[PDB]
């Protein structure tokens, strides 16, 4: 049930409010460009709420995607 090491574990310190850290933010998006749930992010209510605001900033800047196509099916 979504158990493959939460994205927070496999990662170090990072400014959750930094909308430019693509290499870090990129981690919180799925195969698609969708924001991973908390079961996967591992973040907390308060953290996750800031992740979202951050990511949505990245997207508008073009640094991050809104949607991805799935390779398989």
């Amino acid at each position: 049930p979504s158990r493959k090491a939460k994205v927070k574990a496999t990662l170090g310190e990072f400014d959750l409010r930094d909308y430019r850290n693509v290499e870090v933010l990129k981690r919180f998006l799925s195969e698609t460009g969708k924001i991973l749930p908390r079961r996967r992010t591992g973040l907390s209510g308060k953290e996750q709420r800031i992740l979202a605001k951050t990511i949505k900033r990245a997207r508008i800047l073009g640094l991050l995607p809104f949607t991805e196509k799935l390779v398989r099916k």
Partner: protein
């Protein structure tokens, strides 16, 4: 006076000359809006996660200013006027909400 962060994405092309012309209109405009550039980060051109203005890349400029609130919006306008200016996102500064550390 309040502290912000001006984000600007430019045409990933243009010669070393024109690039400096936009940065000329930027500075110029900035000052005209009480822009005290406390920092900058010309990160350069980067591949976008999606094509912006038909192009798959853009030239990113980051700053950090202090200026009169009642004008942030105006400034933002003035900036977007140029064509080579494809993005302008002014975000009110904020202390880093560290996580996992």
């Amino acid at each position: 006076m309040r502290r912000y962060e001006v984000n600007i994405v430019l045409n990933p092309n243009l010669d070393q000359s024109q690039l400096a012309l936009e940065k000329e209109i930027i500075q110029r405009a900035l000052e005209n809006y009480g822009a005290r550039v406390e920092k900058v980060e010309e990160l350069g051109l980067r591949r976008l996660a999606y094509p912006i203005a038909k192009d798959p890349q853009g030239y990113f400029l980051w700053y950090q200013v202090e200026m009169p609130e009642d004008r942030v919006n105006d400034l933002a306008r003035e900036l977007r006027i140029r064509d080579n200016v494809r993005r302008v996102m002014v975000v009110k500064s904020q202390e880093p909400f560290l996580a996992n550390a």
